Design a protein around this motif. Structure first.
Motif, short mmCIF file in Angstrom:
data_model
loop_
_atom_site.label_atom_id
_atom_site.label_comp_id
_atom_site.label_asym_id
_atom_site.label_seq_id
_atom_site.Cartn_x
_atom_site.Cartn_y
_atom_site.Cartn_z
N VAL B 18 0.84 -1.20 0.00
CA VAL B 18 0.00 0.00 0.00
C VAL B 18 0.87 1.24 0.00
CG1 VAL B 18 -1.43 1.42 1.57
CG2 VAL B 18 -2.06 -0.98 0.96
N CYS B 19 1.95 1.23 0.78
CA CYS B 19 2.69 2.46 1.02
C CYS B 19 3.70 2.73 -0.09
CB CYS B 19 3.39 2.44 2.38
SG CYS B 19 2.27 2.41 3.78
N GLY B 20 4.15 1.70 -0.76
CA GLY B 20 5.03 1.90 -1.90
C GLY B 20 6.27 2.68 -1.54
N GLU B 21 6.67 3.59 -2.44
CA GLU B 21 7.93 4.28 -2.23
C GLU B 21 7.91 5.23 -1.02
OE1 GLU B 21 8.82 5.94 -6.07
OE2 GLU B 21 6.70 6.23 -6.59
N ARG B 22 6.73 5.48 -0.44
CA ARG B 22 6.66 6.25 0.80
C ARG B 22 7.29 5.51 1.98
NH1 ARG B 22 0.22 7.16 1.30
NH2 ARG B 22 0.18 5.33 -0.10
N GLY B 23 7.31 4.19 1.95
CA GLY B 23 7.68 3.43 3.09
C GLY B 23 6.66 3.54 4.21
N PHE B 24 7.04 2.95 5.35
CA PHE B 24 6.09 2.79 6.44
C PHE B 24 6.84 2.48 7.72
CE2 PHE B 24 6.76 -1.39 4.60
CZ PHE B 24 6.91 -2.23 5.70
N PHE B 25 6.11 2.52 8.83
CA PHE B 25 6.63 2.04 10.11
C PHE B 25 5.69 0.98 10.65
CE2 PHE B 25 3.90 4.25 13.21
CZ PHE B 25 3.39 5.28 12.45
N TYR B 26 6.29 -0.04 11.25
CA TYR B 26 5.57 -1.18 11.80
C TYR B 26 5.92 -1.22 13.27
CZ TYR B 26 4.02 -5.90 12.85
OH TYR B 26 3.39 -7.02 13.44
N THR B 27 4.96 -0.89 14.15
CA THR B 27 5.17 -0.76 15.58
C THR B 27 4.12 -1.61 16.29
OG1 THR B 27 6.14 1.42 15.28
CG2 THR B 27 5.32 0.87 17.47
N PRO B 28 4.43 -2.87 16.54
CA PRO B 28 3.44 -3.79 17.10
C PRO B 28 3.34 -3.75 18.62
CG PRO B 28 5.45 -4.98 16.48
CD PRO B 28 5.61 -3.58 15.97
N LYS B 29 4.19 -2.99 19.29
CA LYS B 29 4.31 -3.07 20.74
C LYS B 29 2.95 -3.19 21.43
CE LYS B 29 7.76 0.16 21.41
NZ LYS B 29 8.27 1.32 22.20
N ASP B 30 2.86 -4.17 22.33
CA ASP B 30 1.71 -4.40 23.20
C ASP B 30 0.44 -4.72 22.42
OD1 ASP B 30 3.42 -3.79 25.37
OD2 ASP B 30 2.88 -1.65 25.26
N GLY B 31 0.59 -5.22 21.18
CA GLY B 31 -0.54 -5.47 20.32
C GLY B 31 -1.42 -4.25 20.13
N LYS B 32 -0.88 -3.06 20.36
CA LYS B 32 -1.64 -1.83 20.21
C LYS B 32 -1.39 -1.25 18.81
CE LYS B 32 -1.04 2.06 22.52
NZ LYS B 32 -1.17 3.50 22.90
N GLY B 33 -1.85 0.00 18.61
CA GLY B 33 -1.69 0.67 17.32
C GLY B 33 -2.19 -0.20 16.19
N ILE B 34 -1.34 -0.47 15.22
CA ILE B 34 -1.77 -1.17 14.00
C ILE B 34 -2.24 -2.59 14.33
CG2 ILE B 34 0.54 -2.05 13.39
CD1 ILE B 34 -0.24 -1.43 10.50
N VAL B 35 -1.65 -3.23 15.33
CA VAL B 35 -2.03 -4.62 15.62
C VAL B 35 -3.49 -4.69 16.04
CG1 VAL B 35 -1.61 -6.56 17.11
CG2 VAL B 35 0.28 -5.38 16.07
#
Lengths: 53, 53
Positions: B18-35
């Motif tokens: 989805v993010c393509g050349e923009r890149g992204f951050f993956y922050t799964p800590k504590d199953g919060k945020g994106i998780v």
């Protein structure tokens, strides 16, 4: 798996495995940063961990 | 591919596409945020793009 050329999904997969619950950032802009160090040249564990949070 | 439960490598793969050349951050800590939004509940394009750079 980290001591080779890693591009695209292959590179994101290595970050995901190495960084674990820390997570990571993937910033490929202009083929610089991680792309230059791990895709255009041979990656290393040392360099991958520079992109874990 | 984005309107489902996406965990682990499956979630990082969706961010990468989805993010393509923009890149992204993956922050799964504590199953919060994106998780919480995309793995424990059903993900959306809207939510994934919140983690593109």
């Amino acid at each position: 798996f980290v001591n080779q050329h890693l591009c695209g999904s292959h590179l994101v997969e290595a970050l995901y495995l190495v960084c674990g619950e820390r997570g990571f950032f993937y910033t490929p802009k202009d083929g610089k940063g991680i792309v230059e160090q791990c895709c255009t040249s041979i990656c290393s564990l040392y360099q991958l961990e520079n992109y874990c949070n």
